[PDB]
Amino acid sequence: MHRVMGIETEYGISVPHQPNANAMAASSQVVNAYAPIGAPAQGLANVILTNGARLYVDHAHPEYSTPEVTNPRDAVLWDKAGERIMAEAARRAADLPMGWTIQLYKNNTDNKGASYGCHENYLMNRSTPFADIVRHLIPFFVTRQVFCGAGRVGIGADGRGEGFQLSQRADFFEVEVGLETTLKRPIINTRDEPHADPEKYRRLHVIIGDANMSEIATYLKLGTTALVLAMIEDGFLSQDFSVESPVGALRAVSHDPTLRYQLRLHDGRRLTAVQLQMEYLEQARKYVEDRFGTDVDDMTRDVLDRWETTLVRLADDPMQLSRDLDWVAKLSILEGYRQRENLPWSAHKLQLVDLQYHDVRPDRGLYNRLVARGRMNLLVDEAAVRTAMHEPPNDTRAYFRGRCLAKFGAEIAAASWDSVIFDLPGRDSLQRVPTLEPLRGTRAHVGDLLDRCRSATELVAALT
Ligand SMILES: Nc1ncnc2c1ncn2[C@@H]1O[C@H](COP(=O)(O)OP(=O)(O)O)[C@@H](O)[C@H]1O
Ligand SMILES: [Mg+2]
Ligand SMILES: [Mg+2]
Ligand SMILES: [Mg+2]
Ligand SMILES: [Mg+2]
Ligand code: NA
């Protein structure tokens, strides 16, 4: 599989025993405690890291945005590195004089009414009609939470309805299509800031997904979506999967973790979320055969196979997926508490456990404690994750960005997705090197050049 993509994750943040601590100040401490090993991004803390990622305060939250990658396995890897970066940043923040003790959560709600975002970004061709993107992604986004959901205790935006639901974010979305990300949240966000030539490219800005801990969930989330987008772009999909009341269906699907809720399609068909997902899987399979046949790459085949297998197991018995899906693993933990301690779904302790699942600390987060016991299926190994904290992917412009920050960090004034700004001794003016093509500036393009250059001056000279 090959499509430029990236994940932004806004982290939940709290300062224990300082319950009214200013969240912007706490977020700033986190980012500023990690900033010694990045460069300012082009008045809150906002930096680029040597792995090509952005780390910044997005109003009330610290946010980590992966470098651009080309496939869902690398998306998992550099997104997981972001969890390690957040944990280390909070650890370092506490070591600084007057530093606060700050807890961070890779989730989407504080269970107190606030909701924050885990955004997926997908490079698309400008020539794809946005109406087609909307028509074909709304039913997919409504139903993919049967394997993408992270689980949530509490029903409704204020979390006071009693029960468990598939997704953290479903209750906070109110419209089908629109521009905002924090109010009147739209299933299809229309932000158009491509960080590339807008005549050729669109960055599809997806805001509906829960942050996932499980690598299988993040992999399926990004991979299945990317396959659906390939069908949209070519014009492959003939069927109209439109659902009658998309916002209502998003919530109803989430509120039924038995996976029996039947959606009403515009054509009167009644399908479960799993069944509509199966119709997307079967279309994906016909599309890959028609465009690739037996020449399908191994990662595309793996995503197709895992997507199909997961849907069959969800239909048979979702609990056999506890090593794979966040909502299933979390539900398993929660049902254990309900059995051991005779707790109803409204018990406050279950909302604490819900949040603990997402704690970035290796010994305190419940997902991390499952991984420590080898109880979750993983796609990458920890050695690779640690490397990915500091080194970029080799096959996007993040390579050029991250390696320049590592090797020429003394001469970088700022950087962003679309440029690196150099300060050369003896040159009066700052030197802006644009990086407009997401697939230029790879190790194949510039690895040897960067190896050879001993200074930013030699690099900048070579590029003009
Ligand atoms: N042209 C593109 N196509 C797809 N992903 C992109 C593109 N440019 C940047 N990205 C990815 O988009 C995300 C941008 O993060 P951020 O700056 O937080 O975006 P936002 O403008 O939504 O806040 C990153 O994960 C980055 O890798
Ligand atoms: Mg962002
Ligand atoms: Mg944000
Ligand atoms: Mg975003
Ligand atoms: Mg932006
Ligand atoms: Na936002």
Curated annotation (Swiss-Prot):
Its EC number is 3.4.-.-. Mg(2+) 2 binds at residues 8, 119, 205. The keyword Cell wall biogenesis/degradation does not apply. It holds the Pfam family Pup_ligase. ATP binds at residues 65-66, 121, 203. InterPro entries: Pup_deamidase, Pup_ligase/deamidase. Changing residue 185 to A: Abolishes depupylation and deamidation activities. One of its GO terms (molecular function) is metal ion binding. Pathway: Protein degradation; proteasomal Pup-dependent pathway. Mg(2+) 1 binds at residues 8, 56, 63. Its cofactor is ATP. Changing residue 10 to A: Abolishes depupylation and deamidation activities. Changing residue 58 to A: Abolishes depupylation and deamidation activities. It is an enzyme of class 3 (hydrolase). ATP is required for the deamidation and depupylation reactions but is not hydrolyzed during the reactions. Displays depupylase (DPUP) activity, removing conjugated Pup from target proteins; is thus involved in the recycling of Pup and may function similarly to deubiquitinases (DUBs) in eukaryotes to prevent or promote proteasomal degradation of certain proteins. Is also able to catalyze the deamidation of the C-terminal glutamine to glutamate in a variant of the prokaryotic ubiquitin-like protein Pup; however, since Pup from A.cellulolyticus possesses a C-terminal glutamate, this deamidase activity may be of no significance in vivo. Likely interacts with the C-terminal half of the prokaryotic ubiquitin-like protein Pup. Belongs to the Pup ligase/Pup deamidase family. Pup deamidase subfamily. This is Depupylase. It comes from Acidothermus cellulolyticus (strain ATCC 43068 / DSM 8971 / 11B).
